């Protein structure tokens, strides 16, 4: 579909404002709740609606050069931050709440309440994602994935 958005890149605070105001306009996304749906993709901004199952897990990833923001509309999920050593940080983000991050961010979203709903926005568009992996030696790799 398409939202009526600025023809420029948005910074982290602008992306946070965006996902929050979209949450307040169910006309923009309620039909896509019936598991992801693109609300908007152009040269500047990508916006997705995500519907979660309890087992869903993004795995560890960066968004390459994209800033982003997340708003939980319904339910709750865990924002996870990786630490050297392996005692990663976990923060429960509950319905009504949002956060944003710059393009250096590495994270993992998991542990959602069954039926959770969230809105995610990226600028510049999320054309590439870095997905981290560990082999049986424990050695870490980053696979750059195209999501264009």
Binding site for Fe(3+), residues? 61, 63, 107
Q: Walk across the sheet containing 117-123 and list its strands.
A: 36-41, 46-51, 117-123, 67-74, 98-101
In the complex, what is the shortest distance from the CB of residue 80 to a second copy, in angstroms, rounded to a whole number? 10
* Contact between 91 and a second copy per CB under 8 A: no
Q: How far is the CB of 87 from a second copy (least distance, A)?
A: 8
- Check binding of 91 to Mg ion (CB under 5 A): no
Q: Does 94 bind Mg ion (CB under 5 A)?
A: yes
42 binds, among Mg ion, a second copy, none (CB under 5 to 8 A by kind): Mg ion
Is the bond preceding residue 21 a cis peptide, omega within 30 degrees?
A: no
Site string for a second copy, 29-68 (x = CB under 8 A): ---------------------------------x-xx---
Asked whether 57 and 75 are in contact (CB, 8 A), the reply is no
Best CA proximity match to 72, nearest among 108, 125, 115 = 115
- Note whether 42 and 5 are within 8 A (CB): yes
């Amino acid at each position: 579909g398409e939202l009526d958005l600025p023809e420029r890149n948005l910074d982290r605070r602008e992306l946070r404002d965006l996902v929050n105001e979209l949450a307040a306009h169910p006309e923009r996304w309620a039909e896509h709740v019936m598991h992801y749906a693109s609300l908007h993709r152009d040269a500047y901004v990508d916006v997705w609606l995500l519907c979660w199952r309890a087992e869903d897990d993004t795995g560890w990833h960066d968004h390459d050069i994209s800033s982003g923001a997340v708003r939980v509309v319904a339910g709750a999920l865990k924002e996870c931050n990786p630490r050297i050593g392996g005692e990663h940080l976990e923060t429960v983000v509950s319905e009504g709440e949002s956060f944003s991050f710059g393009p250096d961010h590495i994270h993992r979203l998991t542990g959602a309440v069954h039926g959770s709903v969230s809105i995610h926005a990226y600028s510049p568009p999320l054309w590439r994602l870095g997905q981290y992996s560990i082999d049986d030696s424990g050695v870490m790799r980053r696979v750059s994935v195209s999501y264009a």
